[PDB]
Amino acid sequence: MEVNQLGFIATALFVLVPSVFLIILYVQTESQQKSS
Amino acid sequence: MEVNQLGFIATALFVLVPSVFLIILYVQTESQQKSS
Amino acid sequence: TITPSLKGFFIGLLSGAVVLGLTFAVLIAISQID
Amino acid sequence: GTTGERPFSDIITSVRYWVIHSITIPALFIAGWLFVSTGLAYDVFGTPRPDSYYAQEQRSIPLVTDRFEAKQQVETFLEQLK
Amino acid sequence: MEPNPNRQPVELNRTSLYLGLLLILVLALLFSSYFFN
Amino acid sequence: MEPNPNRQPVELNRTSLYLGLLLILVLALLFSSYFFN
Amino acid sequence: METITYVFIFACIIALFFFAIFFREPPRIT
Amino acid sequence: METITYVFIFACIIALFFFAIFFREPPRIT
Amino acid sequence: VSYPIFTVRWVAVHTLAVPTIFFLGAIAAMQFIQR
Amino acid sequence: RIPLWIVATVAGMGVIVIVGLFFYGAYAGLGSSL
Amino acid sequence: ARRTWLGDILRPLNSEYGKVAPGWGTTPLMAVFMGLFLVFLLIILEIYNSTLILDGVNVSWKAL
Amino acid sequence: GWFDILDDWLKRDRFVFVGWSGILLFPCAYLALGGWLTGTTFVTSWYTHGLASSYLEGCNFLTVAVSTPANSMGHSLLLLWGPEAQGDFTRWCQLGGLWTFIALHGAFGLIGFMLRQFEIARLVGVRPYNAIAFSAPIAVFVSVFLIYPLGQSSWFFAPSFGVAAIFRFLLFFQGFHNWTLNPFHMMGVAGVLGGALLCAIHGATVENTLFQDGEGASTFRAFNPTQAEETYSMVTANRFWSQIFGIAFSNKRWLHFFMLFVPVTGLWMSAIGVVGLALNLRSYDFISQEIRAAEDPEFETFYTKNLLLNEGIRAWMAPQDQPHENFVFPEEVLPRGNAL
Amino acid sequence: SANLWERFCNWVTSTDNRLYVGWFGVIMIPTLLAATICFVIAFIAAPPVDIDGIREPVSGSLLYGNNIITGAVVPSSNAIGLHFYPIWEAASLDEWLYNGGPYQLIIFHFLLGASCYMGRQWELSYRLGMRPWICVAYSAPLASAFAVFLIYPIGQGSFSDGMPLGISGTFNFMIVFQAEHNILMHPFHQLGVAGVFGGALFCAMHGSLVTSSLIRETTETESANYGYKFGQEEETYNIVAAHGYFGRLIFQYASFNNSRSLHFFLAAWRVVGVWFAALGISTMAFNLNGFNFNHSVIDAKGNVINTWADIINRANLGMEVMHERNAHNFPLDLA
Amino acid sequence: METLKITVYIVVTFFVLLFVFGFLSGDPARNPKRK
Numbered sequence A, B: 001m002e003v004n005q006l007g008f009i010a011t012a013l014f015v016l017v018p019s020v021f022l023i024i025l026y027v028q029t030e031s032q033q034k035s036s
Numbered sequence C: 001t002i003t004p005s006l007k008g009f010f011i012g013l014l015s016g017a018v019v020l021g022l023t024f025a026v027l028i029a030i031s032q033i034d
Numbered sequence D: 001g002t003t004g005e006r007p008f009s010d011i012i013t014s015v016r017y018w019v020i021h022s023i024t025i026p027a028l029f030i031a032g033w034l035f036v037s038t039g040l041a042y043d044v045f046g047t048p049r050p051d052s053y054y055a056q057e058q059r060s061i062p063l064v065t066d067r068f069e070a071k072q073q074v075e076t077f078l079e080q081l082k
Numbered sequence E, F: 001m002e003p004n005p006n007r008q009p010v011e012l013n014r015t016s017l018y019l020g021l022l023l024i025l026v027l028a029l030l031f032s033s034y035f036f037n
Numbered sequence G, H: 001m002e003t004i005t006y007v008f009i010f011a012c013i014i015a016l017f018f019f020a021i022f023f024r025e026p027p028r029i030t
Numbered sequence I: 001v002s003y004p005i006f007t008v009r010w011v012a013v014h015t016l017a018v019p020t021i022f023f024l025g026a027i028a029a030m031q032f033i034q035r
Numbered sequence J: 001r002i003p004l005w006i007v008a009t010v011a012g013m014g015v016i017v018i019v020g021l022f023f024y025g026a027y028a029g030l031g032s033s034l
Numbered sequence K: 001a002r003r004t005w006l007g008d009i010l011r012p013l014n015s016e017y018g019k020v021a022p023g024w025g026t027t028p029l030m031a032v033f034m035g036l037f038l039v040f041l042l043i044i045l046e047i048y049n050s051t052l053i054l055d056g057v058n059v060s061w062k063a064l
Numbered sequence L: 001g002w003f004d005i006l007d008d009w010l011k012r013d014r015f016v017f018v019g020w021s022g023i024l025l026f027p028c029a030y031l032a033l034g035g036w037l038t039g040t041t042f043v044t045s046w047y048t049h050g051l052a053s054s055y056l057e058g059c060n061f062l063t064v065a066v067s068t069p070a071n072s073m074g075h076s077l078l079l080l081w082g083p084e085a086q087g088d089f090t091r092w093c094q095l096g097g098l099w100t101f102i103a104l105h106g107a108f109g110l111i112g113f114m115l116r117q118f119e120i121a122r123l124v125g126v127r128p129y130n131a132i133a134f135s136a137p138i139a140v141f142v143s144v145f146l147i148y149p150l151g152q153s154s155w156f157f158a159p160s161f162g163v164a165a166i167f168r169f170l171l172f173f174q175g176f177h178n179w180t181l182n183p184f185h186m187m188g189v190a191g192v193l194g195g196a197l198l199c200a201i202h203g204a205t206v207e208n209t210l211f212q213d214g215e216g217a218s219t220f221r222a223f224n225p226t227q228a229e230e231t232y233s234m235v236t237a238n239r240f241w242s243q244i245f246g247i248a249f250s251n252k253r254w255l256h257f258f259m260l261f262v263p264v265t266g267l268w269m270s271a272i273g274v275v276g277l278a279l280n281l282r283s284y285d286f287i288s289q290e291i292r293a294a295e296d297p298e299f300e301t302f303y304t305k306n307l308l309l310n311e312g313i314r315a316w317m318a319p320q321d322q323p324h325e326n327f328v329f330p331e332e333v334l335p336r337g338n339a340l
Numbered sequence M: 001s002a003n004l005w006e007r008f009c010n011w012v013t014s015t016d017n018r019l020y021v022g023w024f025g026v027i028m029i030p031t032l033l034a035a036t037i038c039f040v041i042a043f044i045a046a047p048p049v050d051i052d053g054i055r056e057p058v059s060g061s062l063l064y065g066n067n068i069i070t071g072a073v074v075p076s077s078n079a080i081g082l083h084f085y086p087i088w089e090a091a092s093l094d095e096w097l098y099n100g101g102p103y104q105l106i107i108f109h110f111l112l113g114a115s116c117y118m119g120r121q122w123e124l125s126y127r128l129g130m131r132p133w134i135c136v137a138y139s140a141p142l143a144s145a146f147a148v149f150l151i152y153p154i155g156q157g158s159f160s161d162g163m164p165l166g167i168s169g170t171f172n173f174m175i176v177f178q179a180e181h182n183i184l185m186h187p188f189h190q191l192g193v194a195g196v197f198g199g200a201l202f203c204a205m206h207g208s209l210v211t212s213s214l215i216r217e218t219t220e221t222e223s224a225n226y227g228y229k230f231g232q233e234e235e236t237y238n239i240v241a242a243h244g245y246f247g248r249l250i251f252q253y254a255s256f257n258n259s260r261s262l263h264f265f266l267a268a269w270r271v272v273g274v275w276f277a278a279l280g281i282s283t284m285a286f287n288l289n290g291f292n293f294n295h296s297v298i299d300a301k302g303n304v305i306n307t308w309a310d311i312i313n314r315a316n317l318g319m320e321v322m323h324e325r326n327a328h329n330f331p332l333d334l335a
Numbered sequence N: 001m002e003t004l005k006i007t008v009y010i011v012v013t014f015f016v017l018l019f020v021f022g023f024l025s026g027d028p029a030r031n032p033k034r035k
């Protein structure tokens, strides 16, 4: 299968970068009670 | 330059995955005071 | 079946038992003198 | 900490140390020397003496070839070897 | 070095996060293909 | 559905994080090359 | 390769179904 | 390409120098 | 008081001091093995 | 009893004499190159 | 707490926490199997290493 | 009692501690020092390398080394009473042997000594941590004296237990394993080297931030062995480097700890790395380059320029270093630049 | 104000400026700022360099085909050797480029400002009022960097052979050396590898003990490290219970109770060996290479018995031969 | 390009001069208790 080369860093980073943001913002808040 | 193909997803993810961990654990703590 | 080599080992075991054995005995001995 | 085992300065500076030892120390210094002089040290540890590292004619090295019948080798080398 | 007042905390709850993730995981699932050409 | 006691919080301070990052950013900088072969 | 990328998403998502349904923030009647 | 990867690290690190020196957690004499 | 001559401490200090001089003598001896 | 320094210097010279021997010994010693 | 089906069916086995035999008790017979063990490994290691020989026992790919 | 008598005794002070450990530390460790020593003074190493390894033979301090078993033995523990030697302390002394000895007896000395670090440690109400740090060498000595050799062909290619004979161990790697260019080894120097600084600095950094708490030109006595009193202003510290290097080691538990880490860690990274060399898994490679090394006969990096040195180190030494192969390289085959 | 410089004068010597900048400062600060700037770029993007006496260009820039390890900014060519090849002496900018003039800039610069840091290493120990046998520790370091960039060059006559700024470069500068100096067999380098190894062992020792007799102040959930506050009045460790252990662990008297002495031992060991080492290079800088025992052990007939150093030397020739193939236009590597 | 040659000197001199004139004004002062 001859495909584009950035498929991984493209699709992948697309997932992990914004996702990591949300992840952060959640556990940053669920830790107001020091819980988490 | 004929190099390995995963250079990006390898080296890259190597940076952003563990790093994101530390990032999380920090702002998860610097938010105990609700600040951050 | 008692191959020169095998016999070599027993010999080794015995020497092993000898050095440990002699060693502990003298050791329990001096420890006993206190 | 509380320490109490027979002191050193005592004996290195002791009159008896020097009298038991003066005589016995060089007894070892001498003993070692003799060990070398007799030339037994050589036979003691196979260690060849300058006079006999290579046979007279040959130029090759007496190298141990097979781990199991090694004892032979050594000989057959030390053998033809002067 | 005097604290600025406007230091309000930030908010993203146990759910909003599920959507945020469902939002990405999807496009990611959608565009992936076109990101491979 | 009764809370377990052992819920201690987690810790990584303003600095430890700088090291954690200096730790990775580096190997990353080191191995990158070998990760390219 | 890229077909794992497809299957990884596909999957990671089925599990975003797990959490969002079973460890979802509950409705509080107050 | 990969040489940007080298230069990106090289750089984001110089900036980990920024923060860790100037926005570093201070020494509190108590 | 009266501390023994056969001390734990001593057995060690000896295993070394005996050979050493045995060796040192052996070596000072070699210093001449010409030919 | 016997002064401490006096044992050091005579003990020392020996190390300095014996060691000295060793350096000569490297010139005529078997390990010379002649 | 909160027992259940197995939670009761298996309560004995977990019960006797501190249950400990008195003194040194069994130990000796341990140390006897202990050293008795060593020679096993060693005897194996040594057959393997090629230091221990036996017949119809020359360690090699050949072995039918 | 019966045990505790042995315990009670061997366990309490008496200057040179001797403990439950000592039983294996002292004996193994002793023999070991001896093992190496006897060889350098009297034992030859000719029948394995055709090389002189003893004062007695004429070798000097930097020459003497306790050989390493001919490539004919391989990994056989080469036992004094084993099939090979058959308790013939002269032949057994000749087939090298002392090696496996020194190495194995030795291998315990460490195991044993670390234990002692625990024993004395659990007895004095301290954190064993020292004993842990000590893995640093066990890992090295294990990998580098047992693992690597065990991974290669024979005990032969294993370290040499020499002064120079050990330097050979270097080059030979550089030349064949091109270790110098192996990430893992790198952290190995990143830690030793990095740590040394850490040591030399904390040592001096401390000395200077010392409170004049004595009278005159002897700040070495002015220190209180008796009680708690920060001898070095931790405050005059940070406010120093914080302004001279930009950073401040604010705390002493971590400082005096981070110093534990630095080395021990790198060492491991070394022990890993070499583990690689065991199965010839080495970082010589670097395709990206070599692939383009083919064409463009005019492109040259140090890597290659260096890698070439290696290629010489082979061709010249292999024949005499690895005697059991009876290598033969005619005048021609040897790689050389125009001139010499 | 009577004069406006008055403020410049206290600022430079501002005992409270986040980052002290002494009088050395005013030279260091930029000497390195220019030095670094040239560097960072030369690496990222710089042409090859004829280095060796010929016209064989050695590439050392990431943008020219370098892995971070292969990376390196190359030296000046045997053409210049010692002459001063500053950016203006070269005609076309590209000349300086090719003939490898960045080196001198980078080297000369840091290699300079470095020392001023050494000065400003102490200038703060004066404005701060602290004993200052500190700046000296720093010497050993700077000495070497100076040795590997300034002595050895003056020694062999050309900046050509001065540890090339780059990772794989060092490896090169090295392997070569062994070959031409048998450095490894040099009594100095020994005392060098001596301390370094030591310090790296002591650095883990003294760090080990302290944390091993750390003291009380924590739970198991809490981080034991937290038990301490900056500006403590009494040290965190229990020195007595430390020496009381270590001392015991083999000899009791080969131990330190004198914290001032110990921390000192840590200083001087690494710092002294490193010096010898720094001198080692600087020693062989004028060709007083390491020892040499080739053919030094022989038997009766004269048949020669290889010393375990003859191998050292064997592997040495393998090195001698190859290094710098093409230039060497004569039998003896007299440089 | 003889231009650069001078453009630098000044930049070099200036500094060397700022160096000396800073230490010249004697630093026996500028420490604890201006002594």
Ligand code: CLA
Pocket (backbone or CB within 6 Å): F030, L180, L183, L185, L186, L187, L189, L190, L193, L194, L195, L197, M036, M039, M040, M145, M148, M163, M167, M170, M174
């Ligand atoms: C004096 C100049 C100098 C510098 C800057 C370096 C730098 C380096 N060497 Mg090195 N080296 C040198 C001299 C130098 N070496 C000499 C004279 C020898 C002969 C023995 C060696 C032998 C050697 C080996 C065998 C190895 C290295 C390795 C390294 C790298 C690992 C980090 C390290 O060195 O830990 C030293 C300890 C420290 C505490 C250094 C901390 C400070 C770092 C940041 C120094 C480097 C920072 C960077 C160069 C700054 C760029 C300039 C600026 C614009 C930022 C690093 C790039 C390793 C490597 O190649 O990486 C895989 C490696 O395996 N070196």
Ligand code: CLA
Pocket (backbone or CB within 6 Å): K025, K026, K027, K028, K029, K030, K031, K033, K034, K038, K041, K042, K045
């Ligand atoms: C693998 C299965 C197994 C396991 C996990 C155990 C575990 C145990 N048995 Mg046990 N036992 C077994 C099988 C087993 N047994 C068998 C088959 C028998 C014969 C029926 C016995 C008979 C027996 C008796 C009589 C006793 C025990 C006891 C014990 C307990 C003693 C505590 C202990 O282990 O410290 C011992 C820990 C060590 C010895 C660690 C030291 C080992 C290291 C130091 C070796 C050195 C490493 C070296 C580098 C390698 C050398 C090899 C080289 C030459 C190649 C322990 C729970 C004692 C007990 O209290 O029971 C509750 C006891 O009295 N056992």
Ligand code: CLA
Pocket (backbone or CB within 6 Å): L033, L110, L137, L138, L140, L141, L142, L143, L144, L169, L170, L171, L173, L174, L175, L178, L179, L180, L188, L189, L192, L193, L266, L267, L269, L270, L271, L272, L273, L274, L275, M174, M197
């Ligand atoms: C240039 C800078 C540099 C630096 C800083 C290092 C640093 C290191 N190298 Mg190295 N190396 C270099 C260049 C460098 N190398 C070059 C150019 C080459 C050529 C390729 C090599 C080839 C090389 C090899 C092959 C190996 C190393 C290894 C090492 C590590 C050894 C660890 C150690 O401390 O010994 C560890 C010591 C022991 C394990 C034994 C300890 C014994 C103690 C407990 C007791 C002994 C003393 C006794 C008590 C007293 C009796 C003595 C008696 C004579 C009186 C260390 C990190 C080793 C390593 O890290 O492997 C992973 C290793 O095997 N290097």
Ligand SMILES: C=Cc1c(C)c2cc3nc(c4c5[nH]c(cc6nc(cc1[nH]2)C(C)=C6CC)c(C)c5C(=O)[C@@H]4C(=O)OC)[C@@H](CCC(=O)OC/C=C(\C)CCC[C@@H](C)CCC[C@@H](C)CCCC(C)C)[C@H]3C
Pocket (backbone or CB within 6 Å): L025, L028, L029, L030, L032, L033, L036, L102, L103, L105, L106, L107, L109, L110, L113, L130, L133, L134, L136, L137, L140, L160, L161, L162, L163, L166, L263, L264, L267, M197, M198, M200, M201, M202, M204, M205, M208
């Ligand atoms: C430069 C090499 C090097 C040497 C030779 C060395 C030596 C020593 N390190 C010790 C300790 C340590 N080293 C430590 C970390 C490190 N040590 C390092 C590197 C070294 N450490 C590096 C890698 C790390 C950095 C942290 C820790 C912190 C300790 C300990 O705390 C301990 C100490 O307290 O020292 C004061 C001492 C322990 C003594 C002992 O266990 O004897 C008892 C038992 C022994 C040694 C018998 C072993 C017999 C075996 C090894 C046979 C080997 C025989 C040959 C190797 C001899 C050949 C000689 C050559 C000339 C070929 C001393 C032996």
Ligand SMILES: CCCCCCCCCCCCCCCC(=O)OC[C@H](COP(=O)(O)OC[C@@H](O)CO)OC(=O)CCCCCCCCCCCCCCC
Pocket (backbone or CB within 6 Å): L216, L217, L218, L219, L220, M133, M253, M254, M255, M261, M262, M264, M265, M272
């Ligand atoms: C030396 C390195 C490179 C050059 C080499 C030169 C060759 C010889 C040169 C001689 C002159 C060097 C003078 C150094 C002078 C020097 O370095 O100063 C070190 C330091 C000096 O203190 P200061 O003078 O800085 O103190 C401040 C006040 O004195 C000022 O009022 O104190 C010492 O270390 C004394 C040395 C004792 C050594 C003890 C070491 C620590 C533990 C040792 C204990 C072992 C046994 C313990 C049993 C319990």
Ligand SMILES: CCCCCCCCCCCCCCCC(=O)O[C@H](COC(=O)CCCCCCCCCCCC)CO[C@@H]1O[C@@H](CO)[C@H](O)[C@H](O)[C@@H]1O
Pocket (backbone or CB within 6 Å): B017, B018, B019, B021, B022, F011, F012, F013, F016, F017, F019, F020, F021, F022, F023, F026, L190, L194, L254, L258, L261, L262, M223, M224, M225, M226
């Ligand atoms: C040589 C130059 C090379 C350039 C870089 C070199 C710098 C190396 C510095 C390292 C110091 C030695 C060891 C540092 C440890 C340390 O830092 O420890 C913690 C740091 O956090 C940490 O970093 C924790 C490590 C977590 C890293 C996360 C990525 C790895 C796993 C990701 C998996 C994802 C799938 C901080 O301390 C810890 O936490 C403290 C609380 O803040 C406690 O007080 C204790 O000190 C405890 O040890």
Ligand SMILES: CCCCCCCCCCCCCCCC(=O)O[C@H](COC(=O)CCCCCCCCCCCC)CO[C@@H]1O[C@@H](CO)[C@H](O)[C@H](O)[C@@H]1O
Pocket (backbone or CB within 6 Å): I016, I017, I020, I027, I028, I029, I030, I031, I032, J022, J023, J024, J025, J026, J027, J028, J029, J030, J031, L037, L055, L056, L058, L059, L060, L061
């Ligand atoms: C200043 C001191 C302060 C601290 C640093 C001091 C560093 C001194 C380094 C010197 C080390 C080497 C000595 C020169 C070699 C030499 O030349 O002596 C040789 C044997 O040496 C030796 O036997 C070296 C002795 C070292 C053995 C140490 C073993 C550790 C156990 C000690 C326990 C003590 C209770 C004997 O000569 C050799 O053998 C002769 C044959 O008899 C040959 O003719 C040659 O001369 C050949 O060189």
Ligand SMILES: CCCCCCCCCCCCCCCC(=O)O[C@H](COC(=O)CCCCCCCCCCCC)CO[C@@H]1O[C@@H](CO)[C@H](O)[C@H](O)[C@@H]1O
Pocket (backbone or CB within 6 Å): F013, F014, F015, F016, F018, F019, F022, F026, H013, H016, H017, H020, H021, H025, L244, L245, L246, L247, L248, L249, L250, L251, L254, L255
């Ligand atoms: C070439 C670049 C690529 C490789 C990276 C370069 C390697 C640099 C080596 C530094 C690693 C050692 C970490 C220091 C220990 C420490 O200070 O650790 C903390 C972080 O400090 C830091 O380090 C901050 C990291 C940034 C410092 C580097 C700035 C470079 C500019 C210097 C120019 C000077 C003119 C500071 O405090 C620490 O954490 C505190 C809690 O906040 C504790 O209380 C302790 O003080 C503990 O030491």
Ligand SMILES: CC(C)=CCC/C(C)=C/CC/C(C)=C/CC/C(C)=C/CC/C(C)=C\CC/C(C)=C\CC/C(C)=C/CC1=CC(=O)C(C)=C(C)C1=O
Pocket (backbone or CB within 6 Å): F026, F027, F029, F030, L186, L187, L190, L191, L194, L195, L197, L198, L201, L202, L205, L206, L234, L237, L238, L241, L242, L245, L247, L248, L249, L250, L255, L261, L262, L263, L265, L266
């Ligand atoms: C090519 C490249 C970028 C790197 C090469 C490969 C690399 C980077 C490998 C690193 C990876 C690893 C884990 C290496 C080993 C791990 C390790 C901890 C090594 C030790 C070196 C290291 C990481 C940092 C060095 C620390 C150092 C030299 C100085 C910092 C500590 C310091 C400033 C001490 C002085 C100091 C003393 C003091 O008493 C007080 C009070 C203060 C305030 C101080 O600042």
Ligand SMILES: CC1=C(/C=C/C(C)=C/C=C\C(C)=C\C=C/C=C(C)/C=C/C=C(C)/C=C/C2=C(C)CCCC2(C)C)C(C)(C)CCC1
Pocket (backbone or CB within 6 Å): G004, G007, G008, G011, G012, G014, G015, G017, G018, G019, G021
């Ligand atoms: C290539 C590769 C890989 C990869 C992997 C991956 C990429 C992964 C992953 C991952 C994944 C792939 C994941 C996942 C998952 C998860 C899951 C899968 C889960 C789940 C969930 C579920 C199952 C659910 C359930 C439910 C719910 C939630 C509700 C509704 C419905 C139900 C009830 C059913 C591997 C490793 C293989 C190998 C190596 C390389």
Ligand SMILES: CC1=C(/C=C/C(C)=C/C=C\C(C)=C\C=C/C=C(C)/C=C/C=C(C)/C=C/C2=C(C)CCCC2(C)C)C(C)(C)CCC1
Pocket (backbone or CB within 6 Å): H004, H007, H008, H011, H012, H014, H015, H017, H018, H019, H021, L246
């Ligand atoms: C390819 C690509 C790209 C990429 C990019 C990147 C990858 C980036 C980045 C990034 C980066 C690259 C970053 C960075 C940075 C930062 C910095 C650079 C900073 C800084 C800092 C500083 C500058 C500092 C300062 C200081 C300090 C900190 C202290 C000491 C010293 C001094 C004072 C100087 C681009 C976009 C281009 C384009 C498109 C595509």
Ligand SMILES: CC1=C(/C=C/C(C)=C\C=C/C(C)=C/C=C/C=C(C)/C=C\C=C(C)\C=C\C2=C(C)CCCC2(C)C)C(C)(C)CCC1
Pocket (backbone or CB within 6 Å): I015, I016, I019, I020, I021, I023, I024, J015, J019, L030, L031, L032, L033, L034, L035, L036, L037, L038, L039
């Ligand atoms: C082997 C053997 C054994 C044992 C052994 C021995 C007994 C050894 C020895 C010994 C020894 C134990 C040796 C050694 C030592 C020592 C010495 C003899 C030393 C040395 C030397 C020298 C020469 C030195 C010098 C010096 C010093 C001391 C330091 C400072 C510097 C100087 C130079 C002064 C066993 C039973 C196991 C088995 C059989 C065989």
Ligand SMILES: [Fe+2]
Pocket (backbone or CB within 6 Å): L256, M206, M210, M263
């Ligand atoms: Fe300390």
